[PDB]
Amino acid sequence: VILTGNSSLCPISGWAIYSKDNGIRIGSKGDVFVIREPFISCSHLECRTFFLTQGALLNDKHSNGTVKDRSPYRTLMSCPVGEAPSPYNSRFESVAWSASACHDGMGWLTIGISGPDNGAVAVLKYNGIITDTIKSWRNNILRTQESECACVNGSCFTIMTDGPSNGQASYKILKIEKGKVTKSIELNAPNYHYEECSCYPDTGKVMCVCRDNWHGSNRPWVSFDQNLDYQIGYICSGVFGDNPRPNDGTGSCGPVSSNGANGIKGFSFRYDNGVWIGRTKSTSSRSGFEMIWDPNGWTETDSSFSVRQDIVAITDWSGYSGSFVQHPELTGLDCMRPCFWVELIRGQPKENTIWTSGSSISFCGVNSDTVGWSWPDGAELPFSID
Amino acid sequence: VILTGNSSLCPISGWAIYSKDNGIRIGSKGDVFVIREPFISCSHLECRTFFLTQGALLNDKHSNGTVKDRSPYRTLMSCPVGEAPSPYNSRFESVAWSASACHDGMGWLTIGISGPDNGAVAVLKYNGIITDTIKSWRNNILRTQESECACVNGSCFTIMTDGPSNGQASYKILKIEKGKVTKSIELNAPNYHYEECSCYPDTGKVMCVCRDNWHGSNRPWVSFDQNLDYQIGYICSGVFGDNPRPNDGTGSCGPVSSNGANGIKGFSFRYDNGVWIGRTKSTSSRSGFEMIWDPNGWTETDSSFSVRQDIVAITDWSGYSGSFVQHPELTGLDCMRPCFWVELIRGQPKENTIWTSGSSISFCGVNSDTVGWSWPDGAELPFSID
Amino acid sequence: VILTGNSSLCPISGWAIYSKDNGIRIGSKGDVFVIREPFISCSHLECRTFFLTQGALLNDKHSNGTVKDRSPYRTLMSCPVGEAPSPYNSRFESVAWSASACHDGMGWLTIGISGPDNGAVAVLKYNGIITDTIKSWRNNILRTQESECACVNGSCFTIMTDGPSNGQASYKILKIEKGKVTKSIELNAPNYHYEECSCYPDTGKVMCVCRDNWHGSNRPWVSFDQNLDYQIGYICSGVFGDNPRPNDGTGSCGPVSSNGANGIKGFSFRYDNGVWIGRTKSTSSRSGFEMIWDPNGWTETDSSFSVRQDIVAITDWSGYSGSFVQHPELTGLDCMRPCFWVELIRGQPKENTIWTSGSSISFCGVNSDTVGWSWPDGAELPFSID
Amino acid sequence: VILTGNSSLCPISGWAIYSKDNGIRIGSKGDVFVIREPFISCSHLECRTFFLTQGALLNDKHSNGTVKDRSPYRTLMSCPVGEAPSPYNSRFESVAWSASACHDGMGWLTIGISGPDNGAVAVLKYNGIITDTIKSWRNNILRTQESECACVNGSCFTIMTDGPSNGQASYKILKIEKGKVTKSIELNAPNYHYEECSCYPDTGKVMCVCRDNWHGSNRPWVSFDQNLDYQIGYICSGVFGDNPRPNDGTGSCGPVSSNGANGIKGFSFRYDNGVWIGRTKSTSSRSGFEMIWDPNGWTETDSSFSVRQDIVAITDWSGYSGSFVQHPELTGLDCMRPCFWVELIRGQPKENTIWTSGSSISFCGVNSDTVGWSWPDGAELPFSID
Numbered sequence A, B, C, D: 001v002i003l004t005g006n007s008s009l010c011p012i013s014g015w016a017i018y019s020k021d022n023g024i025r026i027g028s029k030g031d032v033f034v035i036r037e038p039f040i041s042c043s044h045l046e047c048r049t050f051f052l053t054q055g056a057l058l059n060d061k062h063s064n065g066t067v068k069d070r071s072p073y074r075t076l077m078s079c080p081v082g083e084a085p086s087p088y089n090s091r092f093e094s095v096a097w098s099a100s101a102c103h104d105g106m107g108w109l110t111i112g113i114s115g116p117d118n119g120a121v122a123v124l125k126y127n128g129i130i131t132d133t134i135k136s137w138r139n140n141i142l143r144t145q146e147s148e149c150a151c152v153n154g155s156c157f158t159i160m161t162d163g164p165s166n167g168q169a170s171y172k173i174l175k176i177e178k179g180k181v182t183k184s185i186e187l188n189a190p191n192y193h194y195e196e197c198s199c200y201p202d203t204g205k206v207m208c209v210c211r212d213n214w215h216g217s218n219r220p221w222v223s224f225d226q227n228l229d230y231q232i233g234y235i236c237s238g239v240f241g242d243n244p245r246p247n248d249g250t251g252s253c254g255p256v257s258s259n260g261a262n263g264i265k266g267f268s269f270r271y272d273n274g275v276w277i278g279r280t281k282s283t284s285s286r287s288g289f290e291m292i293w294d295p296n297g298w299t300e301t302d303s304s305f306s307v308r309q310d311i312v313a314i315t316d317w318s319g320y321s322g323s324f325v326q327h328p329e330l331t332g333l334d335c336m337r338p339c340f341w342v343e344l345i346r347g348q349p350k351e352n353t354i355w356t357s358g359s360s361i362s363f364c365g366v367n368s369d370t371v372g373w374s375w376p377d378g379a380e381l382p383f384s385i386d
């Protein structure tokens, strides 16, 4: 089957909890990878958690976090959703310190970037066979989504960035068919900054909501059709989505400069003029998580919103978050179902350990009754290795 | 295939041992979840053990019992019958501190309740995809069976409770089709109390035998057809089924008030006016287990019975128990086979440990020779974490 | 696919090594069951190692030997051939302190005996579903092969013993179809003793070579056709097959009384008037292993033989051994291939540990070049738990 | 599916990283085999890592390297590519201290050599069933490739050696069909030395590049067609391929005598008159790894070359390396894709441990952009067992 991707996002009123892996609690005794960015991606048959590991287990000396993030040991692996990421249940995908994956209905596409900062190379695999490579074109840390790419009608789409993370860089949309790049376009986006995009298919097109690490505390977006004809902007809501960020106030259709430097991987779902925003509860640290429905937040700059659903209390650590979808071929629904995952980061720099890892929770949007709560990581730090 | 569920319970004379997982003995060294309620549920192809875990392993500090039962860490998992429940052999099912699951012949239905005490939400999944939610309607600990639901002719049925565990609460029957609630009915049951129901199909209808936590030391039951027309009662036998309970004597068709408060999840199988009762051997603690055949015990209040089969000796810990069936589509028989599982609880509050866990045994009803014995947990407590 | 079982044993000249699991060496660190009798059985698709475990892991306190052999914790498990038997790679089969298993071409039959000594019950499963039970008929430790049963033309056959292990007992052949006992016969075998039979199919019939624990240091045998017409005798060769045994000398077609009490599970393959004998190298302890070809040893009493192939040196521990076959439906050959497994027992009573376990090696008969060697267990005892 | 093997090697410009297993880093805490020679072999559906283990885990006393290399404990296993080789994810293949494996499109062939030095026996398996044996014909350590065999048109091909490793030995090509040897030829190769061959299919023929342990610091080669008509030579490039070796200088069509004794398993790919050479960076120790393209290096003796791609830095340990291919039936390409693996050896003799093991990296040849880097093992030695 080919995922057609022609349906629209399902109407939803809230988010129902889908998974929680308790990876760090389990890794206190079991053999569990130290991981980051545990993104979920689904096929027409199953959902999988992808993640990056340094090839080290929790509570082992090799978890010592003084290793660089872009190291030669870092690999992309995947395990079933909701399971602790272990060498005994994880499939190897690619050598990678930056990554993406998605399924077009016939096979898994994985994208793994490795190599040195001045000449990194993305290796594209389709069903685990190398099908293409993309080399850094600006020689300054080629990097990609750290969540699932989006597939429409037999083609898959991703965003890659090359250049500074504290200034103007270069952004490319890629169209990939059976793992071969068939088209690429560099965005003409002066004064924009795109990193770590969350992209989802919707009505035959793709929407990506990303991270401005240069000078925006609201999130940039880019949407495009199957030929990579594109539009760009920033989410206008004064419910600002990045972290760090200022207190909610008047937004902008351009980058909001106050507290704009630095950031966090996040996501949002557009519903016409409205937007569902996932964000941390703290404005200054990666703490808490909440879903906010702003019925005019895509296009209007006020800070008013209609619904807030709690996900993680502000007293608990959160982390990266990303979108994923479940297509009709998987669900049997007539619409595209939006979902998201949250990474719950424990360890350095906020806690007195030698290591850093995340566990994950995930939710799916439903048009039935839901409830806010807090589903935090739950591990008791420090560990015995510390 | 659709499980028709139109056949009657097989004639049986005793219980043959089906599985034993040795989970706690193995968890002394291996990586084994701390678990509760390991109920079994079967498809037309296989049987699985479902269980709730806090995401903690035996002999690890996170197994510390001080965590509340309704925590955000609690998840429903499943593994093959008879295997130690490990993070390396277990499937994730749902985030849940109360749960149910069953198979209709075409897919697994799982029901997992999480969220706060005043607004819990049951997430319904079919083949692992969220298909519906049910929110608390009394705002007082929505909770369900902790054993398998019952499927007949393409619909699956379960019982949910909301309200006090020491007084009158509210009880609903649900009819579920492919994970969607298609009908629900509130029982009109003043002075009844229903919790932790064990439900099985029989001749196109469902029978549930439950736990009266309020004021009954015999077990209440409810049976209903596919339109949710229902009957309610209490098992009349003077062989009382709950724990705690009084000494055997004259029973009642209503709740037996002596020692009626508190209780334990249990089960029974009705055969016309007779009943097979599974119960602890002790009247005051969760110790021992036995199967009693009382040929007039469903409807008559005397305490005489015909057959007793030992399952666990009175000197050994037992725990929760539940029914499961094997349908003709799985066994090739022309009747519905009754089976049951027993949880063997070790640790708190009876033993000097920081943790509480169960292991499991299970038995199938057969019309051939059987024997009583004792198949206890067998772990040597305390563990080194203690 | 039904295994016809109508072919004869392949002509062979020696034994080629098939598998070695290194179970005890691996279990010094990994999570590995303490096991006994690791017998192999094959289907038309795969070969599996079955084994009995006490539900305890090597190097853990629950491996403490003081538990009796016939305990309620003992279970039959299986894993792929050549893998260390772990809770993470093993399938649960049955609760059992004595067992057998085989595949008829369409499904696995397992036989598991549990319960008390005076009333044990064999539980029969077909495809993991209970299909029959057999209760002790002499109330004195019902017991069976501890190796694979034999299947011919849709029926499987096994031997069960009930009664004394130091005197005359009672022996039954069972005919089983889809897990249901369809016929049984009690052997008329005064002065014979049958235990722990190794049975293989050959030309539409079954041949079993067993253990005389009463008063024979040669091995008894029983052969029968699909109607359970049977013949009985003892292997005549002065190359005595049991352990303990006298030095090789003049054999007997009846039980050889010298060193006759006690014994060890073993096997032999009949080729007309000749026999392949597997035995320990020591006459007094379970040390070493060798295959001997005696071209007239089935029917003649001399102690001369033609070929000896070393398997385990006399300076290394051996243990139980049993036959298995690979049918033409598995191999594509036009004959029945004979194979055997050997258990290498470490620990009590010969070594200063708290535990006893076995690892396994296996060999297949081939008509090409082979070599003798020693393939011992290789663990360094004692372990840290000792 | 029969792999035709009639295509030629794909044109390539560099090497893209395919896998990294981090086995030793993970095995610091996880249950991971001590391994050597982790060679990769692919079917039409998947790629697997084969390896030899002594049946011991990292960080356990049985990893003590005083056990000889040709021991009875040594076994050939396989696991998915990129996963740490563990007893929980590895399938058993054969008892072997020297081994080879490949897939003909319909099934796995494995060759495992065991037994004594003066009479070793290769056991050939097809789909895990013993199909043939080959006994030592010179009684002096029969040994084979330690990498994948080459399959063309329903036949698989391998090289075996018997005789001295410091003098003239005897070399045989084998043609194997469904695991049965159908033809063999002894090379007429006076003054040549062939060990540990890396063989690949190319245009209906097989090319093997090997290790001269006697007196060559360049590598010998043998190529042959499906009838085992063959040609022999040595790689002429003054870019010497063995380790140890002299500094780059004038090559030879025969064995280069300077530093010729001893060696390391390696590989090369012929492209007309040019050659891609994989070699260590150090001339004196097993350190570093690089790929060199020499456009006239197959047939000319100068030390000039065109392209160097770094794989492992000279300050990090490397080890054995070998070729593998991905056939068009797996990739969908119209050519034969060349790939290679590198073993990263840690421990004795270079480091102060009791053990020796390898982890692995692998690369595939592509005609797109690539980059040099260093992907070393990354474990911190010594371990706590030391």
Ligand SMILES: *[C@@H]1O[C@H](CO[C@@H]2O[C@@H](C)[C@@H](O)[C@@H](O)[C@@H]2O)[C@@H](O[C@@H]2O[C@H](CO)[C@@H](O)[C@H](O)[C@H]2NC(C)=O)[C@H](O)[C@H]1NC(C)=O
Residues within 6 Å of the ligand: B153, B154, B155, B177, B204, B226
């Ligand atoms: C078994 O179920 C069938 C299936 O029909 C159900 O009808 C829906 C209302 C809903 O309950 C779904 O689960 C099913 O699809 C029953 O057949 C139907 O019965 C109704 C009324 O009796 C009739 O109007 C329909 O036409 C029937 N449909 C079909 C396809 O036959 C059937 O009654 C059930 N059998 C028993 C013994 O209860």
Ligand SMILES: *[C@@H]1O[C@H](CO[C@@H]2O[C@@H](C)[C@@H](O)[C@@H](O)[C@@H]2O)[C@@H](O[C@@H]2O[C@H](CO)[C@@H](O)[C@H](O)[C@H]2NC(C)=O)[C@H](O)[C@H]1NC(C)=O
Residues within 6 Å of the ligand: D153, D154, D155, D177, D204, D226
């Ligand atoms: C590819 O193989 C076919 C088949 O050859 C047979 O099968 C092989 C597995 C092996 O057993 C060979 O020895 C067999 O001959 C070859 O086709 C055969 O060619 C011969 C003449 O050379 C002819 O007599 C047969 O009839 C052919 N058989 C079939 C089924 O076509 C073919 O030549 C091989 N191709 C190459 C390039 O060598």
Ligand SMILES: *[C@@H]1O[C@H](CO[C@@H]2O[C@@H](C)[C@@H](O)[C@@H](O)[C@@H]2O)[C@@H](O)[C@H](O)[C@H]1NC(C)=O
Residues within 6 Å of the ligand: C153, C154, C155, C177, C204
């Ligand atoms: C082989 O089996 C055939 C099938 O019939 C059998 O019938 C009953 C009695 C059982 O024994 C059951 O296992 C089988 O289904 C026979 O017709 C045939 O005679 C048997 N013997 C042969 C072919 O030699």
Ligand SMILES: *[C@@H]1O[C@H](CO)[C@@H](O)[C@H](O)[C@H]1NC(C)=O
Residues within 6 Å of the ligand: A004, A006, A007, A008, A334
């Ligand atoms: C998508 O396209 C298919 C035809 O290819 C059509 O049947 C279906 O209704 C379309 N869905 C939407 C939501 O447009």
Ligand SMILES: *[C@@H]1O[C@H](CO)[C@@H](O)[C@H](O)[C@H]1NC(C)=O
Residues within 6 Å of the ligand: A061, A064, A065, A066, A354
């Ligand atoms: C962690 O790494 C740093 C840098 O290599 C090292 O200096 C430090 O001592 C390490 N700490 C531990 C606990 O391993």
Ligand SMILES: *[C@@H]1O[C@H](CO)[C@@H](O)[C@H](O)[C@H]1NC(C)=O
Residues within 6 Å of the ligand: A153, A154
């Ligand atoms: C989908 O792809 C197919 C072939 O790749 C093409 O016919 C069509 O233009 C695309 N668009 C839609 C809406 O199907």
Ligand SMILES: *[C@@H]1O[C@H](CO)[C@@H](O)[C@H](O)[C@H]1NC(C)=O
Residues within 6 Å of the ligand: B004, B006, B007, B008
């Ligand atoms: C159930 O339905 C099947 C098929 O209609 C029938 O063969 C079977 O006998 C029925 N059983 C009962 C008890 O109605």
Ligand SMILES: *[C@@H]1O[C@H](CO)[C@@H](O)[C@H](O)[C@H]1NC(C)=O
Residues within 6 Å of the ligand: B061, B064, B065, B066, B354, B385
């Ligand atoms: C268990 O939890 C209690 C709760 O405060 C804590 O005080 C105690 O130290 C814990 N014990 C262990 C062994 O972790």
Ligand SMILES: *[C@@H]1O[C@H](CO)[C@@H](O)[C@H](O)[C@H]1NC(C)=O
Residues within 6 Å of the ligand: C004, C006, C007, C008
């Ligand atoms: C066994 O039966 C099969 C089925 O027809 C036949 O092909 C084969 O030759 C028979 N073998 C013997 C030894 O009778």
Ligand SMILES: *[C@@H]1O[C@H](CO)[C@@H](O)[C@H](O)[C@H]1NC(C)=O
Residues within 6 Å of the ligand: C061, C064, C065, C066, C354
């Ligand atoms: C083993 O079991 C016996 C049984 O009583 C016990 O007395 C002994 O202390 C145990 N030994 C160890 C080392 O656990």
Ligand SMILES: *[C@@H]1O[C@H](CO)[C@@H](O)[C@H](O)[C@H]1NC(C)=O
Residues within 6 Å of the ligand: D004, D006, D007, D008
């Ligand atoms: C290999 O043989 C097949 C036979 O059908 C042919 O189609 C294919 O093109 C051939 N390839 C080459 C490279 O000769």
Ligand SMILES: *[C@@H]1O[C@H](CO)[C@@H](O)[C@H](O)[C@H]1NC(C)=O
Residues within 6 Å of the ligand: D061, D064, D065, D066, D354
């Ligand atoms: C390793 O093996 C040798 C061989 O007997 C032994 O002498 C030595 O003490 C062992 N060392 C360790 C650390 O186990």
Ligand SMILES: [Ca+2]
Residues within 6 Å of the ligand: A211, A212, A213, A214, A215, A216, A217, A218, A242, A243, A244, A259, A260, A261, A262, A263, A264
């Ligand atoms: Ca920002």
Ligand SMILES: [Ca+2]
Residues within 6 Å of the ligand: A237, A294, A295, A296, A297, A300, A301, A302, A303, A304, A305
């Ligand atoms: Ca607004």
Ligand SMILES: [Ca+2]
Residues within 6 Å of the ligand: B211, B212, B213, B214, B215, B216, B217, B242, B243, B244, B259, B260, B261, B262, B263, B264
């Ligand atoms: Ca009660």
Ligand SMILES: [Ca+2]
Residues within 6 Å of the ligand: B237, B294, B295, B296, B297, B300, B302, B303, B304, B305
């Ligand atoms: Ca009664």
